[PDB]
Amino acid sequence: TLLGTALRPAATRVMLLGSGELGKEVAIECQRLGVEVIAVDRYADAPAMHVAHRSHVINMLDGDALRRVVELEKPHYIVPEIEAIATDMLIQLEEEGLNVVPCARATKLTMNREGIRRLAAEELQLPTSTYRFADSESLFREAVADIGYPCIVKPVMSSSGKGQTFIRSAEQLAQAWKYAQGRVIVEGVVKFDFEITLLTVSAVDGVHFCAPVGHRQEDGDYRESWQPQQMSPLALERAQEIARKVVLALGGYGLFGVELFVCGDEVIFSEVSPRPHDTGMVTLISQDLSEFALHVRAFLGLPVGGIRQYGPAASAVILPQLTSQNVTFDNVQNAVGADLQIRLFGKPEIDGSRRLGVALATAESVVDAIERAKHAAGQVKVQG
Amino acid sequence: TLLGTALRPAATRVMLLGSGELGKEVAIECQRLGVEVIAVDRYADAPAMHVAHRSHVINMLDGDALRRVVELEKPHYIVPEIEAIATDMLIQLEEEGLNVVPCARATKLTMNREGIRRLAAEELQLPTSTYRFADSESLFREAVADIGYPCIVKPVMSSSGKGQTFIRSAEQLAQAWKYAQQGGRVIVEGVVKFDFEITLLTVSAVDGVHFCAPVGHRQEDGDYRESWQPQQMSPLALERAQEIARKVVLALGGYGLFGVELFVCGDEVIFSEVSPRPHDTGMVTLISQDLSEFALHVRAFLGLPVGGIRQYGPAASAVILPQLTSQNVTFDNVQNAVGADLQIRLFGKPEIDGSRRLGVALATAESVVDAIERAKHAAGQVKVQG
Ligand SMILES: Nc1ncnc2c1ncn2[C@@H]1O[C@H](COP(=O)(O)OP(=O)(O)OP(=O)(O)O)[C@@H](O)[C@H]1O
Ligand SMILES: Nc1ncnc2c1ncn2[C@@H]1O[C@H](COP(=O)(O)OP(=O)(O)OP(=O)(O)O)[C@@H](O)[C@H]1O
Ligand SMILES: NCC(=O)N[C@@H]1O[C@H](COP(=O)([O-])[O-])[C@@H](O)[C@H]1O
Ligand SMILES: NCC(=O)N[C@@H]1O[C@H](COP(=O)([O-])[O-])[C@@H](O)[C@H]1O
Ligand SMILES: [Cl-]
Ligand SMILES: [Cl-]
Ligand SMILES: [Cl-]
Ligand SMILES: [Cl-]
Ligand SMILES: [Mg+2]
Ligand SMILES: [Mg+2]
Ligand SMILES: [Mg+2]
Ligand SMILES: [Mg+2]
Ligand code: NA
Ligand code: NA
């Protein structure tokens, strides 16, 4: 691995496709290595742009626009930070010689619930929920019958529950199908003891895992996350096995977020993000290398070696709901202290619910860490 | 404490005067809280400029130039990152309403050895080396004669060991003086034969004075080469060092993190000098603590309570200090410079013309000895080309 000096002719260039809080941390990690960072997003002054060398505002779903930006900057690494990008152009560009992290195919496959679910369930032969594909209210209708209730519905092009529907009732199918709007996937409910994110890094020295991350979701948003999630060694063994198979099948170097359901000693694969994952923001205080630092280490072709975990830790989001273009944060003095920090993203405005920052905490117990982080997030007064 | 959103009208604005590797991390910690950062230096594309919202290049020793940039950017905080700045202008501006971190008087006393040395020794009655000042060669010679051999001569305004000479005999007198003219008044100090030297990173904040665990360090050519933490000290030595550091910071005044350099002789502690801001040796804290010295400086100056500092165990830093001339530096063999419990930082400095600290290796281990070896070895593996 040879790195140039940012801004100099031999500079090593990284292009972020998506500049939110996740990309912000990736950017800092690149910067820490003198790596040149070009932050791209669909709006100006996105978090990652504040810490990048330069930025571009474009419609990332527009393949032609993406090719132009890429051609213009000639990056050595194309690092997707969100799902919503023109994966097809990534494939083409990769084919043209461009380095897409972890690989273009992994981006495409995971973007579509159909590709990924078939790969894992079928090809890889791993445990998943019961599933089905349909392409019409009729098909929806007949599928949802196949699944039965309880049951889940998601566009094959859904995120953060975007267009998802939890179906216990026949009445919903009015709502359901419309909300889903295209085409969809219908899954049969898993009753797990808990869910985890197994952050798995694929690098030159093989695949390494972070301690399991537990989390609480609410209204399609993670609220809190913690590490390490308590689970059996047997269960952990199984989870690791599932994660390795998945990451190796997707291919390429990077940090992946493997979503799994845990039922006693059994583990079931749900999905996977071929990039750093929100719940993993706890690693900003819980490990020597954050998931962001791990991603960069991996993609640059550098070895990981190991990952140190610093005891019970948690993250708790700062998720206000208001409309403003000049947000201020008061009472900060009561949101920081021993074993407690906060991050404020730099998002330019808000109009509805939006993740503007995160609280991070460590404690003697996971329960205590969660509380310290939750309390700290609650102390911040978000003004408009 | 209220913070705005960077780039927005109510933004909280921080101006760094000096944009080296130290300011770079201060900038990153500001950015992590959505603090708007303006990076100023004497050259373009300085490290902190890479991670700042806006940058400016001016003569920081020119008070009028300083006033123009501050007037232009209207920062809420002026955060000097180096000693060589127009400190009288900072006093002026502070009077005019600006918040200078930690305070303008602290910057003024420490930018010139005479201010701080006389304060510490004379006013605070802290233990220090013997010393004399001199502004002519003849007086310099009288000074050396009174001080005795060996002694160290240094320009009153200097850092990283520039213009200094370890004087062992009269034979060096002439070149030493000259050389102290390349890098004005000078200080002549008696040599303290210490067992080891430390940097006690001391944070003065809204919730009091807090101390990081002692950071040991090895200097060469008066420039740091390796640092580690914790440095073992007797209970008595640690208590004395803390007392000294507490006195210095409170005397200098204002919130911020200060790098208090001390010499240790068994259970006795002697004061050397202090940075009224993050310290180079303190870069070990990038791996060794929950909150790095940069994060602590920011926390403090923003008026937030520190609460406490967590130390992860034995760790060390080792500099990446090549020697060449180039304006297009590359770093190869990076795959042999990082791994388990091992990291590096490459600063983004635009060029080199001789020796220049371009990066740092960081490591953790079960002992500082092992940590130091791992960091040194990694720094060494880096293939610097240009
Ligand atoms: N078959 C299922 N059984 C039980 N719960 C499920 C199932 N499918 C999804 N969930 C629940 O829905 C949550 C979000 O749905 P899912 O992870 O499948 O996709 P998503 O909405 O696109 O989220 P993401 O933002 O991670 O892409 C999961 O974290 C889990 O709590
Ligand atoms: N009186 C003294 N006795 C013994 N050693 C000393 C004395 N003064 C300085 N040194 C040695 O030289 C090193 C550098 O000296 P000093 O800190 O004064 O220089 P500097 O140019 O101000 O460096 P910087 O500001 O970057 O720390 C010390 O850390 C110590 O190793
Ligand atoms: N759950 C996915 C996730 O956390 N994505 C993160 O949020 C950004 C968008 O935030 P925004 O919608 O507020 O602009 C993305 O850019 C990414 O950093
Ligand atoms: N002990 C002082 C010290 O470490 N100063 C650090 O070195 C920079 C200058 O480096 P440069 O000479 O390579 O430009 C300063 O800006 C500061 O960060
Ligand atoms: Cl592992
Ligand atoms: Cl300095
Ligand atoms: Cl960090
Ligand atoms: Cl190799
Ligand atoms: Mg998804
Ligand atoms: Mg999910
Ligand atoms: Mg000094
Ligand atoms: Mg010194
Ligand atoms: Na690749
Ligand atoms: Na002040």
Q: Does residue B161 carry a catalytic annotation? A: yes
Q: Which domains, ranges and CATH numbers included, belong to chain B?
A: 1-121 (3.40.50.20), 122-190 (3.30.1490.20), 191-385 (3.30.470.20)
Spell out a b/e string for B299-328, using b for 16 or more CB atoms within 10 Å of the CB, else e: bbbbebbbeebeeeebbbbbbbbbeeebee
Q: Whose CA is nearest to atom 26 of ligand 1?
A: A160
CA separation, residue B377 to residues A124, B215, B281, B339, B342 (Å): 42, 20, 18, 12, 10
- Check: CB of residue B29 under 8 Å from CB of residue B51: no
Strand partners, B38: B15, B54
In 10 A of CB B1, how many CB atoms? 16
Residues whose CB falls within 8 Å of the CB of residue B174, separated by 6 or more in sequence, listed in order = none
Alpha carbon A93 to its chain centroid, in Å, reads 23
Contact B330 A45 (CB under 8 A): no
Write out chain B residues lying below 8 Å of A331, CB-based.
Answer: 1
Contact A333 B303 (CB under 8 A): yes
Contact B9 A336 (CB under 8 A): no
What separation in Å is there between the alpha carbon of A249 and the centre of ligand 1? Answer: 21
Question: B159, B160, B319: which to mutate for ligand 4, most atoms within 8 A of CB?
Answer: B160
In which residue are the tokens 């180039």 written?
B326
Q: Name the percent of chain A in helix, strand, coil, to the closest 5.
A: 35, 30, 35
- Give the nearest partner residue to B50 out of A6, A10, A329, using CB atoms: A6
- CA dihedral sign of residues A216, A222, A223, A226: positive
Q: How does DSSP assign A52-99, residue by residue?
A: SSEEEE--TT-HHHHHHHHHHH--SEEEE-SS-S-HHHHHHHHHTT--
A68 annotated ligand binder: no
Q: Does residue A159 carry a catalytic annotation? A: yes
Gap between the Cα atoms of A269 and A250, Å rounded: 14
Strands (E), B114-170: 131-134, 151-155, 165-167
Measured between CB atoms, does B334 come within 8 Å of chain A? yes
Strand partners, A202: A207, A254
Gap between the Cα atoms of A4 and B355, Å rounded: 18
Q: How does DSSP assign A212-241, residue by residue?
A: PEEEEEETTEEEEEEESPP--HHHHHHHHH
Strand partners, A100: A78
What separation in Å is there between the alpha carbon of B131 and the centre of ligand 11? Answer: 15
Measured between CB atoms, does B208 come within 8 Å of chain A? no
- Among the listed residues A278, A286, A290, A297, the single catalytic one is A278
Query: Phi and psi dihedrals of A14, rounded to 5?
Result: -115, 130
Annotated binding site of B: 21-22, 81, 113, 154, 159-164, 189-192, 197, 261, 273, 280, 349, 356-357
